[PDB]
Write a protein that binds this ligand. Structure first.
Ligand SMILES: Nc1nc2c(ncn2[C@@H]2O[C@H](COP(=O)(O)OP(=O)(O)O)[C@@H](O)[C@H]2O)c(=O)[nH]1
Ligand SMILES: Nc1nc2c(ncn2[C@@H]2O[C@H](COP(=O)(O)OP(=O)(O)O)[C@@H](O)[C@H]2O)c(=O)[nH]1
Lengths: 338, 340
């Protein structure tokens, strides 16, 4: 059930109106080592989107220009590490870091997992008069003019979410991957598949004869999505689980062993809860054969709830991110090695 | 006043006596380049001392041998522990666990054990001496070994001043002992202070004696203050330097970790970090040097902060905390380091 997750995401993007104030100029340098696609990804990231709400940003790649912040990956400006990879920050080289790790380094570190950036993208994609997911009226993501292509590009997804189709009436499980360098994921696919065919839409263990173009639509045509990170890391939860929720399919998840902190464990199969893959496949078989249990899981809120409110772990929100950067900007300390 | 610091350190070293000499084996891999001298030094470090209280330690320097832990900061897939004397944060991609100076919490993966604690271990050992002016509680751990008798002979001036046989006011102004020249802020501050009041240099940097002092602690005891600067700034980076000051019965003029007040009672030393510039700090040093009362108030303060009268090490650093950290490491089978 993606709608409640979207609802919470939208709330988490709520910030105070500053009418009398005007977004001051903020100059951000990105390291030269950064290639063009990496610069375009950063400009399109939720982090950039959030900061553009409070600052008039100029992004550039000139080391001779004095900047407010400099973003990199492994000068006397404040350096900020930000990556999508399963890589812990080097604090000798970077003054501040944004990542997935479950670590507390006071003002020097902020946890903002890639799933939050994937939610940003889903939210914008749903500002469409034909989308099956609703954005609260007049909220930030409802501000831009909507598109009208959603239903056309995701027919089966709209249909199942729109209750015009039966969720039980679908294929077994999808697997979309093109990075082959992930043994555990490759081996769980082989395992599961030898018990029930699993459909492959990416370069890896491909079964279609081509590589799916719309992962979203493709996942909506199956009851489950084999949802493995490329490696294990505590707190390392990427876009993958978000793609499963959004596509209205049960995620069979592996990657971050602490993923239950981030998402409602009743809403997905957590392979980390089992002692071996066999026991996990035993639970996956059960769900596929017990319609109630299957539907119960598919209708759970993807988020955990506390004090009557669904919540993102450690209250990840636009305000948390903005406060983290306001503290960086106001502090003159340079922590990196010189 | 080193005595109360030594008293807290000794209590922090209190743990239960191992039941009947059946200490399980612990194999630790260390630097392959280490010679017998670095090995000797390691076998005498506080971490080794603490672990030897609960394990029978074997050190490994052969790369083709299995170990329970792989230490240091030079065995890709072993249980790796980062530990360095440098002002360097851990690479948690490469190391499963780390011990350092950073004020960071990474749950079971990180423990803060500043070098100052290891320096205290060495001072404690050196005062298990029948001629020392500092006392180790009876029958406690550092008093269990046989005591030496050379302390006073090597630290006459130090013993005199601590033994109340010398006047602390009747001493030179300030000592500076450094041989690592690559320390801008430090070298410059000496120049700043020396230009107002001569500072005696005992190391290779800004040396004024004509030779390098052999016993740092005896030398520092002959001056009212000790210019005690770290080589670089780092939050939590407090090394053996400030301990050497306390031990020498002289007031540390400190700069290094901006948060040093968490570790030590700020009424016991001059925290250069508390001033917007160096002039202001030397103006405060100038004042202490010329107001006997304020000077003696500072020299007599407990080096440690206290809570409800009880002195404490910041975050309760202790042999128990360190042993618990290692017991968790040893019993946890999760591999955290990048697994190729
Ligand atoms: N539409 C589509 N998406 C894909 C394909 N292959 C992988 N993806 C998705 O793109 C993202 C990157 O997956 P991948 O390339 O395997 O690198 P990974 O992040 O290391 O697993 C994941 O969310 C995949 O599900 C494909 O062939 N088509
Ligand atoms: N006895 C003695 N101690 C020294 C001498 N030079 C430095 N030290 C001490 O050795 C330690 C390291 O000093 P140093 O070589 O400058 O490396 P640093 O850690 O960067 O300051 C400090 O505690 C110094 O005070 C010296 O010439 N004689």
């Amino acid at each position: 059930m993606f709608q409640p997750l979207l609802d919470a995401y939208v709330e988490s993007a709520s910030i105070e109106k500053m009418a009398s104030k005007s977004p001051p100029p903020l100059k951000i340098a990105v390291a030269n080592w950064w290639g063009d696609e990496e610069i375009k990804e950063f400009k399109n990231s939720v982090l950039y989107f959030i900061l553009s709400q409070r600052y008039t940003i100029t992004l550039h790649q000139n080391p001779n220009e004095f900047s407010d912040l400099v973003f990199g990956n492994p000068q006397n400006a404040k350096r900020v590490f930000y990556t999508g990879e399963n890589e812990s920050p080097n604090f000798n080289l970077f003054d501040y870091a944004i990542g997935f790790d479950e670590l507390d380094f006071n003002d020097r570190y902020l946890r903002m997992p890639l799933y939050y950036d994937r939610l940003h993208h889903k939210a914008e994609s749903v500002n469409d008069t034909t989308a099956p997911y609703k954005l609260k009226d007049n909220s930030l993501y409802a501000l831009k003019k909507p598109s009208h292509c959603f239903k056309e590009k995701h027919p089966n997804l709209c249909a199942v979410v729109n209750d015009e189709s039966d969720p039980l009436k679908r294929g077994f499980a999808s697997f979309v991957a093109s990075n082959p360098n992930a043994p555990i994921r490759n081996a769980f696919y082989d395992a599961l598949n030898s018990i029930e065919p699993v459909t492959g839409g990416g370069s890896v263990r491909n079964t279609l004869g081509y590589n799916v173009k719309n992962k979203n639509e493709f996942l909506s045509q199956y009851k489950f999505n084999l949802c493995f990170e490329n490696t294990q890391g505590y707190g390392y939860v990427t876009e993958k689980i978000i793609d499963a929720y959004f596509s209205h399919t049960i995620p069979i998840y592996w990657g971050s062993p602490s993923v239950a902190k981030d998402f409602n464990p009743k809403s997905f199969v957590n392979v980390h809860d089992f002692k071996n893959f066999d026991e996990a496949i035993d639970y996956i078989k059960y769900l596929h054969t017990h319609k109630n249990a299957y539907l119960d899981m598919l209708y759970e809120n993807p988020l955990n709830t506390l004090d009557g409110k669904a919540y993102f772990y450690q209250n990840l929100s636009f305000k948390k991110i903005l406060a983290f950067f306001k503290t960086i900007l106001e502090n003159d300390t340079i922590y990196h090695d010189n």
